[PDB]
Design an enzyme around this catalytic site. Structure first.
Site, mmCIF file in Angstrom:
data_model
loop_
_atom_site.group_PDB
_atom_site.id
_atom_site.type_symbol
_atom_site.label_atom_id
_atom_site.label_comp_id
_atom_site.label_asym_id
_atom_site.label_seq_id
_atom_site.Cartn_x
_atom_site.Cartn_y
_atom_site.Cartn_z
ATOM 1 C CG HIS A 1 18.610 -1.263 -1.962
ATOM 2 N ND1 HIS A 1 17.444 -0.966 -1.305
ATOM 3 C CD2 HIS A 1 18.444 -0.868 -3.240
ATOM 4 C CE1 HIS A 1 16.594 -0.416 -2.148
ATOM 5 N NE2 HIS A 1 17.190 -0.330 -3.342
ATOM 6 N N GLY B 1 13.643 1.135 -10.102
ATOM 7 C CA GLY B 1 14.233 2.462 -10.340
ATOM 8 C C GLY B 1 13.623 3.521 -9.442
ATOM 9 C CB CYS C 1 14.766 2.184 -4.573
ATOM 10 S SG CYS C 1 13.761 0.672 -4.500
HETATM 11 C C1 LIG Z 1 14.558 -0.446 -5.693
HETATM 12 C C2 LIG Z 1 15.196 0.196 -6.899
HETATM 13 O O1 LIG Z 1 14.661 1.164 -7.426
HETATM 14 N N1 LIG Z 1 16.325 -0.357 -7.401
HETATM 15 C C3 LIG Z 1 17.172 -1.390 -6.798
HETATM 16 C C4 LIG Z 1 17.237 -2.595 -7.700
HETATM 17 N N2 LIG Z 1 17.718 -2.173 -9.026
HETATM 18 S S1 LIG Z 1 18.311 -3.320 -10.035
HETATM 19 O O2 LIG Z 1 18.835 -4.365 -9.211
HETATM 20 O O3 LIG Z 1 19.176 -2.637 -10.946
HETATM 21 C C5 LIG Z 1 16.960 -3.968 -10.978
HETATM 22 C C6 LIG Z 1 16.717 -3.505 -12.263
HETATM 23 F F1 LIG Z 1 17.511 -2.550 -12.796
HETATM 24 C C7 LIG Z 1 15.681 -3.994 -13.020
HETATM 25 C C8 LIG Z 1 14.871 -4.969 -12.475
HETATM 26 C C9 LIG Z 1 15.084 -5.458 -11.199
HETATM 27 C C10 LIG Z 1 16.127 -4.949 -10.463
HETATM 28 F F2 LIG Z 1 16.330 -5.425 -9.212
HETATM 29 C C11 LIG Z 1 16.848 -1.151 -9.626
HETATM 30 C C12 LIG Z 1 16.834 0.042 -8.712
#
Ligand SMILES: *CC(=O)N1CCN(S(=O)(=O)c2c(F)cccc2F)CC1
Ligand SMILES: *CC(=O)N1CCN(S(=O)(=O)c2c(F)cccc2F)CC1
Lengths: 304, 304
Positions: free
Chosen positions: A41, A143, A145
Site C-alpha cells: 500500500h 508512518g 506500517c
Molecule cells: C500505514 C502507514 O504507515 N502509512 C500508509 C498511509 N500513509 S499516508 O497515506 O501518507 C498518511 C499520512 F502520511 C498521514 C496521515 C494519514 C495517512 F494515511 C502513512 C504511512
C-alpha cells in the site's frame, strides 16, 4: 525473581529497518540481504486505498519510483515485485547487518516482539500476541506500517509479522513476510470487523505457573478439574478451548512447580468464577495471556 | 492508535554489554570507551556477601583477576578502581560501538528500559519505573547483575541504573552509573525492607490521558477537584501527592485532549473511590503508573 512483559533485544532488527517512499507515502521496510520488504500500500494515494487494484497501480511504478533510505544513504532499487500484500524491492547492496533469519507464519496465541518504527528509525519495542481473531493489539501511528514482529532463537531472527492496517476499532492487522494477512483482513480502507477476541487459555496457565515460581501463590486452591469440565467454563468465559497439546506444552512448568496442569486449570476456573476480589497476580488485576509457556520457561531460566 | 508498555530499542546498549568474571562470580559489565562498569560485589564469595569489606577484598584483586569478555574476545584490563558500589575496569580497547551517552541519576517515578543480560549476552528488554521507595520491580535471575537501565534521547543513551540486589521480598535495588544506590540499600546480604510502594499519581494521570487519546473514555466523569481535595484522597489510597509541578508537566496532554488536569484528577478520584467495576482501561484492570507524561507524549507522537 520478578516477571515482566519482556521483548527480545531489538538490535538485530534495528539493523534491518529502512525508509521506503513511493510518491508522497513514507513507511518502513525490512532490509535482508539485497531485498527490501514493505507493505504494497506504499504505492497507494489514500484515495487508491478505498478500492485499490494493486497490479494496476504497480504498472505505473518503476524501480526509481521506490525511494529506499538506510540511515541517511539512498539504496539503488534494481528490481521490484509484489508477493501477496508485500513488495520485494531488490537493491544493489546486501544489508551488511543482515542477521541469520527465517520467515515464519505464527499461530494465534503466539507472542512476538514488535519494533515500532517511523521513517525507518526505531521508536520503541514491545511484546504482542497474535490474538485468536488474528488481530494484534499494537501501538502504531501513521508512518508505522512495515514495522515488523519477530522472535529470536539465540542468533536467528524469525520474522512473523509486518504491520499494514488499523481496523476502525483500533486493533491491528498485518502479514507474515510472504505478504499473507493473518486472518481475513485485506489492505483496503473498508469495513473490516474482528471476530471474538478470546483469551489464550494456555498462555494464562503459563503465566499462573510464572506467578507461583515468583511467589504469587494466593490463588492456588484445593481443587482439580478435567479438560472437558474446564472447557465448559472456558467457553462460558470466552477462553480458548484447552487441548492435550496445551497440557503437554505446560508439562515442564507442571514439573518445576509440582502443580498438575489440571490442578492449575481448577485454580483458573475459580479465578474466572470468583474474580480477583481486588487482588493482583504478578502486578496484574486481570489474567495475562500474552506469555507463552516457552516465554515463561525462557524468562524463568534466563535464555540469551 | 493503541498504547503499549514500550521499551527503547536496545541495540545501542546491546553493543555495550560484556561478561565480567572475578574468581567464580560471573555477571555483566557496561563497556563505554575504555572503561567497563560492573557491580563491586563481583569480587565477593557469597560468604563475603554477608558482611563484605570491599576496600579490604579489593586489595587481594589485581587487573588480571578481572576477566572481561566482549562476545568471544577477551579485553585486557590495564586498571581498576572502586567508585561507590561499582568497579571501573580500564581496558586497553575503546568500545568501538560506544554510543553517545550520559550518566543520569533519575527521580522516583521516572521510567527507563532495562536490557536484562546473562554472561554479557542480552536476554530481553522491558520498561520499569524507579518506585517511590527507590526499588524497581524487575525480572532478574542470578547472573543478571550489571544489567543496566537507560533512556534514549534520539542518539544519546542516558544510563540511569545498574542492577545489584534482590530484596528478600523479590523487588530490586541498584545504583546509578556512579555506583550510588537508589534509596537506602547496600550491597550486603542483610535484612533490607522497602518502604511503602506508593502509586506514581502523575504517571497514572498521563496514562488516563493516553487512554482518552486512544478512545478509552468511559471513566471520564462530570466532576472536577482541587489539588488539596485530590491529595486527601491520594494520601488515603497510597498515591503520591500531586504538585503544581506535576500539573504543569501534564499541560501538553491537557491541551491535546481539552481535559483540564484537575478534571482528570476528579476522574482518578472516582476510580479510586468506586474501583473499575470489572472494566478495563487500555487493557488494564488497574491504574498503570509506569508511563511518564513524557512517555505518553513520545508514544502518542511517535518520536524516534
Ligand atoms: C500505514 C502507514 O504507515 N502509512 C500508509 C498511509 N500513509 S499516508 O497515506 O501518507 C498518511 C499520512 F502520511 C498521514 C496521515 C494519514 C495517512 F494515511 C502513512 C504511512
Ligand atoms: C547478582 C548476580 O548476578 N551475581 C552475583 C552472585 N553470583 S554467584 O554468587 O555466583 C551465584 C550463582 F552463581 C548462582 C546462584 C546464586 C549466586 F549467588 C551470580 C552473579
Amino acid at each position: 525473581s520478578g516477571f515482566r512483559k519482556m521483548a527480545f533485544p531489538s538490535g538485530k532488527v534495528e539493523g534491518c529497518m529502512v525508509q521506503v517512499t513511493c510518491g508522497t507515502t513514507t513507511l518502513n521496510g525490512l532490509w535482508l540481504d539485497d531485498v527490501v520488504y514493505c507493505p504494497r500500500h506504499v504505492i497507494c494515494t489514500s484515495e487508491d486505498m478505498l478500492n485499490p487494484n494493486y497490479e494496476d497501480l504497480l504498472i505505473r511504478k518503476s524501480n526509481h519510483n521506490f525511494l529506499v533510505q538506510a540511515g541517511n544513504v539512498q539504496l539503488r532499487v534494481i528490481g521490484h515485485s509484489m508477493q501477496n500484500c508485500v513488495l520485494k524491492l531488490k537493491v544493489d547492496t546486501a544489508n551488511p547487518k543482515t542477521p541469520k533469519y527465517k520467515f515464519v507464519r505464527i499461530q494465534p496465541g503466539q507472542t512476538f516482539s514488535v519494533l515500532a518504527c517511523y521513517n525507518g528509525s526505531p521508536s520503541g519495542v514491545y511484546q504482542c500476541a497474535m490474538r485468536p481473531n488474528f488481530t494484534i493489539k499494537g501501538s502504531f501511528l501513521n508512518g508505522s506500517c512495515g514495522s515488523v514482529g519477530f522472535n529470536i532463537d539465540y542468533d536467528c531472527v524469525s520474522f512473523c509479522y509486518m504491520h499494514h492496517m488499523e481496523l476502525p476499532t483500533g486493533v491491528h492487522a498485518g502479514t507474515d513476510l510472504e505478504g499473507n494477512f493473518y486472518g481475513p483482513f485485506v489492505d483496503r480502507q473498508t469495513a473490516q470487523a474482528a471476530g471474538t477476541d478470546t483469551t489464550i487459555t494456555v498462555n494464562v496457565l503459563a503465566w499462573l505457573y510464572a506467578a507461583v515460581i515468583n511467589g504469587d501463590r494466593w490463588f492456588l486452591n484445593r481443587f482439580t478439574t478435567t479438560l472437558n469440565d474446564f472447557n465448559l467454563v472456558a467457553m462460558k468465559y470466552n477462553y480458548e478451548p484447552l487441548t492435550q497439546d496445551h497440557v503437554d506444552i505446560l508439562g515442564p512448568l507442571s514439573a518445576q512447580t509440582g502443580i498438575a496442569v489440571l490442578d492449575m486449570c481448577a485454580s483458573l476456573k475459580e479465578l474466572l468464577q470468583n474474580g480477583m476480589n481486588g487482588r493482583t497476580i504478578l502486578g496484574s488485576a486481570l489474567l495475562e495471556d500474552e506469555f507463552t509457556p516457552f516465554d515463561v520457561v525462557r524468562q524463568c531460566s534466563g535464555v540469551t
